[PDB]
């Protein structure tokens, strides 16, 4: 188990769910809402 943890950490692949943007549908480019 310890060697499995060390292999994942070194060649780092983690199975955590990642924080996605809440407006990925309507704003897919992710533009910034200020001066353009």
């Amino acid at each position: 188990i310890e060697e499995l943890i060390k292999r994942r950490i070194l060649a780092g692949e983690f199975d955590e769910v990642l924080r996605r943007r809440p407006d990925m549908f309507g704003n897919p480019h992710g533009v910034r809402r200020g001066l353009v």
């Binding site: 533009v31 809402r33 001066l35 353009v36």
Partner: protein
């Protein structure tokens, strides 16, 4: 588990580092020790050698008004002060980051300026032992220093900088060479002139004379050019007569005389030397009518030349206590009393017990040396292909044999019985010489780099250029086995006293241990940071340690290994160059190690914060007003004697100090701190707000904390009495400051309106036609929802 220690070190006169000094003694720099010779008799007087330091020494300076104290500058950035009476270091100075390169002393000798390669020049006091200050100019390294007080320096960014010392900032700069580098500095002893030697062989000449206006001190009075176009190492002036010596790192030293600048300076003489001179130095002997120019070469020698002032003669020389170029091989006697060292150009054999040379021969190049048993004769295999034979007791050359044609004898090994020698060369063959008569040859695939026998004369082992080792039988030359697995060609090998182990040193930065029955690698052990030159076993197992071996490499290290437990038992430092050869004793009690160093060696709270700052400023105000009353009474000497925190922060006003301590805090913390401030601390704050509004600075901050003070204490102010006086003062001052600032900004905005309307009137239109459609900023302003 007995370790090794440095006990002896010799074979060296002046290194390739700079700065020779004369005192009739010559004080020069060996690697880490500064050693002083007599020039008349070749016996050295003394050596200055410190156990705490290992780094090499590279700058020497004699103190004026007191010889027998000297300043040496090392490679790690330290300075030591030695005495010539007693060989100790009285004071040590660890100020710089790297590589002290130019020293200088005051005229009175109480002050010492040291300029480094890390470009700092630091001046040092010699009665308080404190780093005085740190002068900071100079894009890159400082190559010249002098004390004119005043300082005159020059750097590798081709700038002469004239520094002050009473106010530690530069007064003048000038640029000596336009697109080159100023490399050397020479000052006249009466401070009338300075000549700076640059990269092209051009010598620029400057005249010196002895703040709000245009200060002009250094004047480029003209340029000179010497004969050789090399980077000039030094310019040394005569302390008494009218001469100087200019030299680069070459075989010529050009002595010019002082009578356009080309008319003022003419070359008196050009002195040729036998080797490249690193540092020239001047010497005046009592009772002679001459110029004793003392050159110290890169090729390991001192020469004292006599120059007649109104030709050169090689008057004195020191060459006997050192090899002159570079030791390539060592071989020490069977009686272990004397050793031989074989260098390019020479053979010099030495005594161990006295560390003084006994015999000297001349050979062309010297790859490999080994003496024959009885230690009467020595064998040298050279680069030109030949094998020379010399003898010690009559000190002569017996025989010479063209072993290979033009192919360097890379390996020589004497038979353990002592009747034959084997020379393996840069040709494919390896030849056997019986005594000498050629007995048998061995043709093999590539060039033989190194071969060694067995201590019981049973098997031979050659080591090729094909990154492989061939172990043969000694009687008939049949291939017993071959060892592989080296990525780069084998440089050396040594096999054990009972022939059960081989160590094999390669250029791929590791050594291998083979078992020599079946030739299995015991353990490949990566142990050096560079290509390991040589290896050697200790031959006697009388002391119980015969499976230990030394390995010397290009990373300036020897390593003591154990092959039985496969472990490094010691790391031997102490060499400052790529160690070319080493040998162990037949008793094994000491070993010699010969380097590129040319030195062969022998080894045996926010509110409380602003409140206390308010109190500091209040005491400062009381002291300043008392000093005002005193200086109004009389102009007598009256010191204000304010706080050491103020005279360390730089004699700032108390207003500036309390303004900075009010400015440092973030605005929410400012609100909380002024809330936490008590009413005993309020009146001091009100006086300082009066001071801010009087000498207007941060008027919004002043008004902000003032209105906070009044609003959080409104009843207490209108009940107290002295707040009437100080609040009337702050009202008058703040109203004047606000009205002044407001009227200035109103004049500005009115003028900008006027000039904008006039610019519109200029801009409007020239033509008139039917289309007035020719006659605005726009911003983008994205928004997501």
């Amino acid at each position: 588990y007995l370790k090794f220690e440095p006990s002896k070190s010799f074979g060296v006169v002046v290194s390739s580092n700079s700065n020779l000094v004369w005192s009739g003694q010559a004080i020069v720099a060996a690697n880490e020790e500064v050693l002083v010779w007599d020039i008349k008799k070749g016996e050295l007087l003394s050596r200055w050698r410190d156990e705490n330091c290992k780094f090499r020494v590279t700058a020497i300076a004699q103190s004026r008004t007191d010889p027998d104290v000297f300043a040496v500058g090392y490679e790690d950035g330290s300075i030591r002060l030695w005495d010539s009476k007693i060989a100790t270091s009285v004071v040590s100075f660890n100020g710089h980051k790297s590589a002290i390169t130019v020293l200088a002393f005051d005229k009175t000798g109480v002050r010492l300026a040291s300029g480094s390669k890390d470009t700092d020049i630091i001046v040092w006091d010699l009665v308080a032992e404190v780093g005085q200050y740190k002068l900071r100019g100079h894009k890159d390294q400082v190559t010249g220093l002098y004390f004119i007080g005043f300082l005159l320096t020059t750097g590798k960014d081709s700038l002469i900088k004239l520094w002050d010392l009473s106010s530690r900032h530069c007064i003048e700069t000038h640029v000596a060479q336009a697109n080159g580098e100023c490399w050397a500095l020479g000052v006249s002893p009466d401070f009338t002139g300075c000549i700076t030697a640059g990269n092209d062989g051009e010598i620029t000449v400057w005249a010196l004379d002895a703040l709000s206006q245009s200060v002009n001190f250094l004047q480029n009075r003209g340029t000179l050019h010497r004969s050789s176009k090399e980077r000039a190492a030094e310019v040394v002036f005569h302390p008494l007569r009218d001469y100087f010596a200019v030299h680069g790192v070459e075989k010529s030293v050009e002595i010019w005389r002082i009578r356009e600048v080309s008319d003022v300076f003419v070359q008196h003489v050009i002195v040729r030397t036998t080797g490249k001179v690193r540092s020239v130095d001047w010497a005046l002997n009592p009772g002679v009518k001459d110029l004793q120019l003392l050159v110290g070469g890169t090729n390991n020698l001192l020469e004292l030349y006599n120059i007649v002032g109104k030709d050169y003669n090689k008057a004195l020389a020191v060459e006997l206590p050192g090899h002159r170029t570079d030791i390539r091989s060592v071989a020490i006697s069977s009686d272990d009393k004397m050793l031989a060292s074989a260098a390019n150009g020479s053979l010099k054999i030495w005594n161990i017990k006295t560390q003084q040379c006994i015999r000297t021969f001349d050979c062309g190049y010297a790859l490999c040396c080994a003496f024959l048993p009885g230690d009467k004769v020595v064998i040298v295999g050279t680069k030109e292909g030949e094998l020379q034979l010399y003898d010690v007791a009559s000190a002569s050359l017996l025989e010479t044999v063209n072993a290979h044609d033009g192919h360097a004898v890379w390996a020589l090994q004497v038979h353990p019985d002592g009747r034959s020698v084997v020379s393996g060369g840069a040709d494919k063959t390896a030849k056997f010489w019986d005594f000498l008569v050629q007995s048998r040859i061995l043709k093999v695939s590539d060039d033989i780099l190194s071969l060694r026998f067995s201590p019981d004369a049973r098997l031979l082992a050659v080591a090729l250029l094909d990154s492989t080792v061939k172990v043969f039988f000694n009687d008939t030359l049949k291939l017993y086995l071959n060892l592989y697995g080296h990525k780069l060609p084998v440089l050396s090998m040594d096999i054990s006293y009972d022939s059960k182990l081989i160590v094999t040193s390669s250029a791929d930065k590791n050594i291998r241990i083979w078992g020599l029955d079946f030739g299995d690698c015991h353990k490949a052990l990566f142990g050096h940071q560079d290509s390991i030159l040589q290896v050697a076993f200790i031959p006697h197992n009388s002391d119980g340690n015969g499976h230990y071996f030394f390995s010397a490499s290009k990373d300036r290290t020897i390593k003591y290994w154990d092959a039985d437990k496969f472990e490094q038992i010691q790391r031997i430092d102490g060499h400052h160059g790529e160690i070319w050869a080493l040998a162990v004793s037949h008793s094994g009690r000491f070993l010699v190690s010969a380097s590129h160093d040319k030195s062969i060696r022998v080894w045996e709270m926010a509110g409380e914060r602003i409140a206390e700052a308010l109190e500091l400023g209040m005491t400062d105000l009381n002291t300043i007003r008392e000093w005002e009353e005193a200086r109004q009474i009389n102009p007598n000497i009256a010191p204000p004697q304010r706080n050491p925190i103020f005279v360390a922060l730089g004699n700032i006003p108390a207003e500036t100090y309390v303004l900075n301590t009010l400015q440092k805090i973030k605005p929410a913390s400012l609100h909380d701190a002024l809330l936490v401030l008590p009413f005993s601390t309020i009146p001091s704050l009100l006086t300082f707000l009066n001071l801010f509004a009087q000498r207007e600075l941060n008027v919004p901050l002043t008004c902000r904390i003032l209105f906070f003070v009044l609003k959080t204490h409104h009843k207490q102010i209108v009940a107290s009495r002295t707040m009437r006086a100080t609040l009337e003062k702050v009202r008058a001052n703040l109203r004047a400051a606000l009205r002044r600032q407001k009227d200035e900004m109103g004049f500005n905005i009115a003028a900008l309106k006027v000039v904008s309307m006039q610019l519109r009137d200029k801009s409007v239109r020239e033509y008139v036609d039917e289309t007035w459609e020719e006659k605005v900023r726009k911003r983008a302003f994205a928004s997501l929802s």
